């Protein structure tokens, strides 16, 4: 049962991160204010 | 533009292990509402 | 006669440096409850700065612990030196921890035969800084899976500053798989451990002791049941 729980955790974690990245990209497209945010798969860069 | 980006955000995200976006549920509810409207009496071109 | 334990401590001052010696041991009728622990540390305060060297080693049936520390202490915020820990456990897995700190870099990692090698390195500088959190697979110590990474960069041109945060889903998934695979590894060692102690003392397994308890329960149940049946005949006869 421990191994099954960890398997499901990995599965949903992976299935979830891609949707999060897509939503983040769509949100970042909203604004172009002076502090510029660059989003990448598995990475985020912040310029201040 | 704001409504467009909000629609993009809604379309692009859903919970893991399900690939049906919430916009289909919204369209289903809109279809039900339109069916009720056409059922309703006192129809007007403004309803169309 | 059954139990003898000795705790010996001594603090000594020798001109320029202090020396701390600690000893502790126990003699027991129990085999796995006897040991000897020892530590030695020489402490020299040179014109206010401290130079520290200490060794702590433990001995026991189920493992032995060996730790080395060296370094110096300038002020309350500048310790430069190395710390190395090595564990030899027949009872469970072994481990080897290495900690390093220089004025411009901190590096440390732990090599576990079950998880692998988990380490983190901090390179610090005025105009840049980078934090690296990596997991090297147990099956591949030659590469580092970046669990996370931070990169601060203050631009020397203009007033801009960059923050770059990076992570690997691969590292997290591999570590999760290693952890879920490690469950039986701990379970078996602990099970054999408890059975080993049961053997050392009464010669029985945990399952053997469970079976003995069940058998004794059954025996006592019959002992009660026979008398419960007999009392009926006793009462009937006396009534007649």
Residue A26, chain B, CB below 8 Å: the answer is yes
Beta-sheet strands, E only, within chain C:
4-14, 17-27, 35-46, 49-60, 64-74, 78-88, 95-102, 105-112, 116-124, 128-137, 145-154, 161-167
- Residue C166 makes CB contacts below 8 A (sequence gap 6+) with A42, A43, C146, C148, C149, C151
Give the CA distances from residue C68 to residues A31, C23, C84, C100, in Å, rounded to whole numbers and listed in that order: 55, 17, 5, 12
- Residue C18 makes CB contacts below 8 A (sequence gap 6+) with C11, C12, C42, C43, C44
Cα-based angle C25, C28, C29 (whole degrees, multiple of 5): 165
Taking an 8 Å cut-off on Cβ atoms, the answer to whether A15 and B17 are in contact is: yes
- Residue B33 makes CB contacts below 8 A (sequence gap 6+) with none
Give the CA distances from residue C184 to residues C63, C96, C179, C196, in Å, rounded to whole numbers and listed in that order: 21, 22, 10, 18
Do B and C make contact via 3 or more CB pairs under 8 A? The reply is no
> Is C5 exposed, middle or buried (CB count within 10 Å of its CB: 0-12, 13-18, 19+)?
exposed
Residue A17, chain B, CB below 8 Å: the answer is no
CB C163 within 8 A of CB A46: yes
HSE on the CB side for C40, CA within 13 Å? 0
- Residue C186 makes CB contacts below 8 A (sequence gap 6+) with C92
Subunits close to C (at least 3 CB pairs below 8 A): A
> Is C179 exposed, middle or buried (CB count within 10 Å of its CB: 0-12, 13-18, 19+)?
middle
CB pairs under 8 A between A and C: 47
CB C11 within 8 A of CB C176: no
The count of other CB atoms within 10 Å of the CB of residue A1 is 6
Helix axes A2-28, C169-202, angle to 10 degrees: 160
HSE on the CB side for C233, CA within 13 Å? 5
């Amino acid at each position: 049962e421990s191994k099954r729980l960890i398997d499901l955790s990995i599965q949903n974690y992976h299935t979830f991160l891609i949707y999060i990245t897509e939503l983040l990209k769509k949100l970042q497209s909203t604004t172009v204010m002076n502090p510029y945010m660059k989003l990448a798969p598995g990475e985020l860069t912040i310029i201040l | 533009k704001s409504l467009h980006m909000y629609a993009n955000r809604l379309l692009d995200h859903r919970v893991p292990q399900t690939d049906m976006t919430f916009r289909h549920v919204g369209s289903k509810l809109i279809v039900a509402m339109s069916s009720w409207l056409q059922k309703a009496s006192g129809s007007l071109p403004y309803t169309q | 006669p059954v139990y003898n334990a000795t705790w010996s401590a001594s603090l000594k001052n020798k001109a320029d440096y202090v020396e701390t010696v600690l000893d502790s041991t126990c003699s027991s009728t129990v085999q796995f409850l006897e040991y000897e622990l020892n530590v030695l540390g020489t402490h020299k305060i040179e014109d206010g700065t401290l130079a520290s060297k200490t060794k702590g080693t433990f001995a026991h049936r189920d493992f032995s612990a060996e730790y080395e520390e060296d370094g110096k202490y300038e002020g309350l915020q500048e310790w430069e030196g190395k710390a190395h820990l090595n564990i030899k456990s027949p009872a469970f897995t072994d481990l080897h921890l290495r900690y390093q700190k220089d004025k411009k870099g901190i590096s440390t990692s732990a090599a576990s035969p079950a998880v692998g090698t988990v380490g983190m390195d901090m390179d610090e500088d005025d105009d840049f800084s980078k934090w690296n959190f990596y997991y090297s697979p147990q099956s591949s110590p030659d590469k580092k899976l970046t669990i996370f990474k931070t990169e601060l960069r203050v631009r020397e041109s203009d007033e801009e500053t960059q923050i770059k945060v990076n992570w690997e889903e691969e590292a997290a998934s591999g570590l999760l798989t290693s952890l879920k695979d490690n469950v039986p590894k701990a379970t078996g060692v602990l099970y054999d451990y408890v059975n080993k102690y049961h053997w050392e003392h009464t010669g029985l397994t945990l399952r053997e002791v469970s079976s003995k308890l069940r058998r004794n329960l059954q025996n006592n149940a019959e002992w009660v049941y026979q008398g419960a049946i007999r009392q009926i005949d006793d009462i009937d006869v006396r009534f007649q």
